[PDB]
Structure formats: C-alpha cells, structure tokens
Amino acid sequence: KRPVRVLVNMDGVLADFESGLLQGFRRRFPEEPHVPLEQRRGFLANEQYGALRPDLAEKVASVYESPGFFLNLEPIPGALDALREMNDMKDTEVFICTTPLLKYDHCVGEKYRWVEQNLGPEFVERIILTRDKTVVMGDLLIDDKDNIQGLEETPSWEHILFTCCHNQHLALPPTRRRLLSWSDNWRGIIESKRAS
Amino acid sequence: KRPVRVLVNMDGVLADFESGLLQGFRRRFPEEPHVPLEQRRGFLANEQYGALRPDLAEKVASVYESPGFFLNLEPIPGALDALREMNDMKDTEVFICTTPLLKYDHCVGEKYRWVEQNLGPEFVERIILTRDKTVVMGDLLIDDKDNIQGLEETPSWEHILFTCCHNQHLALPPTRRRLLSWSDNWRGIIESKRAS
Numbered sequence: 167k168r169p170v171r172v173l174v175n176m177d178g179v180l181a182d183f184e185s186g187l188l189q190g191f192r193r194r195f196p197e198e199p200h201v202p203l204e205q206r207r208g209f210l211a212n213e214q215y216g217a218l219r220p221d222l223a224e225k226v227a228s229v230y231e232s233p234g235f236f237l238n239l240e241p242i243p244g245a246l247d248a249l250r251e252m253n254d255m256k257d258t259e260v261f262i263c264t265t266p267l268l269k270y271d272h273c274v275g276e277k278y279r280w281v282e283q284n285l286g287p288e289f290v291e292r293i294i295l296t297r298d299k300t301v302v303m304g305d306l307l308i309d310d311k312d313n314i315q316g317l318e319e320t321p322s323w324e325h326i327l328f329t330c331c332h333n334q335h336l337a338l339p340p341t342r343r344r345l346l347s348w349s350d351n352w353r354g355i356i357e358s359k360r361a362s
Numbered sequence: 363k364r365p366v367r368v369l370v371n372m373d374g375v376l377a378d379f380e381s382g383l384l385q386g387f388r389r390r391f392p393e394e395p396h397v398p399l400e401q402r403r404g405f406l407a408n409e410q411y412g413a414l415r416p417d418l419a420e421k422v423a424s425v426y427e428s429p430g431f432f433l434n435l436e437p438i439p440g441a442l443d444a445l446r447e448m449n450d451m452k453d454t455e456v457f458i459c460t461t462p463l464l465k466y467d468h469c470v471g472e473k474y475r476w477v478e479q480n481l482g483p484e485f486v487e488r489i490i491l492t493r494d495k496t497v498v499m500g501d502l503l504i505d506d507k508d509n510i511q512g513l514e515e516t517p518s519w520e521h522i523l524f525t526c527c528h529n530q531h532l533a534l535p536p537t538r539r540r541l542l543s544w545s546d547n548w549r550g551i552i553e554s555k556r557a558s
C-alpha cells in the first residue's frame with residue numbers, strides 16, 4: 167500500500183567528496199604525503215591523514231572547509247541518472263539526507279546550491295539536513311558511512327551501505343546489505359521493502 | 363522508559379519572524395500599507411499583503427529574501443530560557459526543526475548562524491532542516507503553523523500549536539492542544555507524553 171520512502175545520502179553517494187578532497191589536497195599541498203583513494207580506510211579522511219602525520223589532519227580539513235569545496239564536487243558516477251529514475255518510480259518517495267559540517271559556513275548553503283545545480287530545483291525541496299539520521303523516517307537509507315548512530319535505537323529504515331573507497335575493505339555481517347555502485351540493483355532492493 | 367523527543371520549530375517559536383518582517387517592511391516601504399501584527403491572519407504573510415494589494419506580496423517577500431533578515435531576527439520572548447531549560451531536562455531530547463525558503467541563498471546559512479549566536483554551538487548540532495516535518499520522528503512538534511502537511515499520513519509526533527499573531531484567532535477543535543507562550547506550561551505537556 168504505502169509508498170517506499172528512500173533516504174539517499176549526499177557525500178559519498180551523490181557527491182564525490184573523496185575525489186574532490188584528494189584533488190584539492192594535492193593542488194593545495196603538493197609537497198605533502200597524500201592518501202590515494204584505493205588506500206582510504208575509515209569514514210573520516212582527516213583522521214587517516216592525522217594518523218599519517220598529526221598536522222595533516224588540519225591541512226586536509228582546511229580543504230573541505232574552504233569556500234567552493236562543496237559547491238564544486240563532481241557527481242558520483244551514475245548518481246544523477248539513478249536518482250532521477252528513482253524519483254520517477256511510482257509509489258516511491260526520495261529525500262536527500264545529508265550531515266553538514268559543524269563548521270557550517272561554507273557547507274550548508276553550498277550543499278543546497280549543489281543539489282539545485284546538479285539535480286534541479288525539484289530536488290532542493292527534498293533536502294533534509296541533520297546530524298542525526300536515526301530520527302528521519304524512511305524505509306531505506308543509502309549511505310556510505312559504516313556505523314550510523316543517533317538517538318533512535320531502532321531506526322525505521324534499513325541501512326544499505328553504499329560502496330566507497332573508504333568502506334570497500336570493510337567486512338560486514340551478511341545481515342548488512344551493500345550497494346556496490348549505482349549500476350548495482352537498487353531497484354530490487356526497493357522492491358524487497360515494498361514486499362514487507 | 364524512552365526519553366521524550368521534542369521538535370521545536372524555529373520561525374514563530376524561537377525566532378520572531380513576524381516582528382522582524384513588519385519592522386523591515388515599514389523601514390523599506392515606509393509609504394505602503396502594512397498589516398499590524400494584531401491583524402495578521404494565516405501562516406503566509408506574503409499572501410495577506412498580496413490580498414491587500416497584489417504587488418505588496420513581492421515587496422514583503424523581498425524583505426525576508428534580503429541578506430541579514432534571518433540572521434538578525436530577535437528571539438521570541440522567553441524562548442532561549444525555555445529551550446535551555448528543556449534541553450537540560452533528564453530523559454528529554456530537543457531538536458530544532460525548521461523549513462528553509464526555496465530561495466535558500468540568504469536563508470539556510472543565516473539560520474545556522476542564528477542558532478549559534480542566540481543559543482550556542484551545542485544547539486547547532488540539533489538543527490534539522492526539512493520541507494516535510496512529518497518524516498521527522500519525535501513525540502511533540504511545537505510549531506506555529508496551523509496545518510502541517512507532508513508525506514507521512516500519521517506523523518509520530520503530536521503537534522502543539524504555538525500561539526503567534528497569525529494563528530491567535532484560529533479556532534481549533536478541542537483535540538488540538540496549544541502553547542499560549544513560553545510562559546504556558548510546556549513542562550506539563552512533555553510529562554503528558556512521557557505518561558503514554
């Protein structure tokens with residue numbers, strides 16, 4: 167009966183944060199050690215750089231804290247096509263669910279403009295900003311972060327782990343489902359939820 | 363057992379949108395007819411001005427679309443004290459739930475900064491931006507808008523209508539509860555939900 171509501175995360179799922187961060191880092195700090203994408207481990211890139219050398223955490227953070235960083239991210243391959251297709255499905259509801267930096271200044275407005283520019287005004291209406299995704303109601307949350315925590319102990323959604331460089335090597339119990347890319351069968355996953 | 367989660371709306375509840383809009387309108391359009399606060403009817407002030415004279419809708423909208431408008435709103439009387447007290451209550455969870463203008467440019471960043479400045483960094487962590495409040499999970503939604511609509515037919519929260527100039531005269535069925543101001547007994551309302 168109900169439409170299936172799909173919460174789609176922004177960084178790592180629609181917007182290519184990892185590519186944008188590396189390219190920005192190499193351009194700004196061309197003499198510093200970097201972490202190639204294939205070597206990324208763990209959600210927070212600043213913490214990986216920090217573990218390489220403590221001051222690199224602040225340097226890498228200065229890249230994503232800069233004006234224009236979020237504005238100019240390239241889309242994840244296939245994301246715009248998939249989201250448009252998903253959005254057009256009957257009895258299917260799409261929201262974009264994104265966590266802004268606590269340093270919100272050059273992040274929150276740029277995320278709105280990114281959606282307007284890469285997807286369209288129609289998608290801006292479906293943006294949800296939150297630091298706690300567990301209080302947002304949906305059937306699915308497609309998100310590259312491995313451990314999603316918040317105040318709601320049993321969220322209404324099932325978390326589908328979207329594959330990204332930083333979570334590629336992560337071993338998950340078989341109860342946890344992954345989306346390998348937008349070319350993996352996200353449609354079937356949506357149908358699995360309609361069925362229950 | 364559960365904490366009680368309270369969603370507190372921003373415009374009309376924490377931030378004095380109506381006062382700020384009238385003062386901005388009289389300062390910018392000193393020769394135009396205005397709507398005194400006591401005469402406000404209906405949620406959308408632009409539509410009331412528009413019904414007075416069609417071009418006044420665009421003039422009044424230009425006020426809340428201006429840089430600095432959201433940044434500089436004065437707090438609703440008693441709001442900062444009540445939210446701090448509420449936030450400190452045991453087994454009580456507070457989020458700030460606000461709908462940004464579709465013209466997001468001078469709205470979304472300014473709302474974040476407003477919370478940082480009037481409440482504090484600790485409250486910025488609890489901001490939720492959404493155009494659909496029905497998909498946010500809470501026990502209460504304290505909100506001045508009279509008809510809250512969205513995709514979720516039966517929201518998890520009970521809507522407590524926060525009294526504002528524009529909804530003062532609105533007749534509500536007795537099943538709908540109101541908060542007359544922050545000096546009305548919002549604590550008791552929270553206890554009524556803990557009880558169920």
Ligand SMILES: O=c1ccn([C@H]2C[C@H](O)[C@@H](COP(=O)(O)O)O2)c(=O)[nH]1
Nearest residue numbers: 177209210211212264265266267311
């Ligand atoms: O190295 C990193 C990686 C991500 N983030 C923050 C940036 C975004 O604000 C937020 C992305 O969160 P998600 O919505 O993708 O969970 O994570 C960082 O601060 N540092």
Ligand SMILES: O=c1ccn([C@H]2C[C@H](O)[C@@H](COP(=O)(O)O)O2)c(=O)[nH]1
Nearest residue numbers: 373405406407408460461462463507
């Ligand atoms: O005359 C008005 C009154 C309010 N709003 C918009 C401004 C805010 O973005 C939003 C406030 O929504 P709430 O979160 O308070 O429901 O309403 C207008 O566009 N015009």
Ligand SMILES: [Mg+2]
Nearest residue numbers: 175177178310
């Ligand atoms: Mg992400």
Ligand SMILES: [Mg+2]
Nearest residue numbers: 371373374506
């Ligand atoms: Mg309001």
